[PDB]
Design a protein around this ligand. Sequence first.
Ligand SMILES: [Zn+2]
Ligand SMILES: [Zn+2]
Lengths: 149, 149
Amino acid sequence: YTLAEFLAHAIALETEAAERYVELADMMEAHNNLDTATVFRDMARFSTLHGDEIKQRSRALELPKLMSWQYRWKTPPEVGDEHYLMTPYHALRYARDNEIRGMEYYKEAAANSADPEVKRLGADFAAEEAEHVVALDKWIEKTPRPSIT
Amino acid sequence: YTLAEFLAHAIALETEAAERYVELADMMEAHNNLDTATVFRDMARFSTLHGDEIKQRSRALELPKLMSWQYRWKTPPEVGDEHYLMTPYHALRYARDNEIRGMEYYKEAAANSADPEVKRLGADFAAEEAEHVVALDKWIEKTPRPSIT
Ligand SMILES: [Zn+2]
Ligand SMILES: [Zn+2]
């Protein structure tokens, strides 16, 4: 809604993405899925760069403290309580789900906010997140499906 | 499983609980649900005290870094994407769900670990988390159910 609120969301979304992607990179690497690990390093790096841009913008404003559910990635499928996310197919899909949630926040903000800057950044940020979803879709396509057991 | 692993879980569970309870306390207070806010302040305080105990234990060991899904509270019901958790009935049930997940981790560790200390702390910690669930059940009983609209 407001630009302060929007920038708080954007920073939180990016801080979260950086952490979650490093974590996924680490897991890919540890099981020698080096290509997928690198997709996630790239994404974690984009988070840092983009987050830094948003942080420069936000120096002008007093930002609200957000609640965790406003920005955290959704918890993944809960089996058997603990792995599933160690396979590339499942990590990529998890990452994609949350890329989409971030995209949707940006699109919703750009549509419903009266502040033209929120409209502008929301649209810009949504378009870029959309390119991430498309890129992850291309990966998921080429990624073989694992079997349980 | 191992004591290092167990203590890493316990610390993470408590760091997480403290943050989540402060957050819920803040929301209760902000809507003048002062009794429920205080239940959550009490819990956040228990986290700090208990976490500090676990931290003293863990100085003896190199702890593994855990993945977020190993210790984070589950994300709450996702509607309409954003509130629901501002009502006491919904915050208490959310808190209870995650108290139960923590209890279950402790019980599972105590049952499946060969290390007698993990067995001992796991049982001790599970029994106390169980008292928290029972306390939240008593609250949920006395808490009126809200209506949407
Ligand atoms: Zn993205
Ligand atoms: Zn508890």
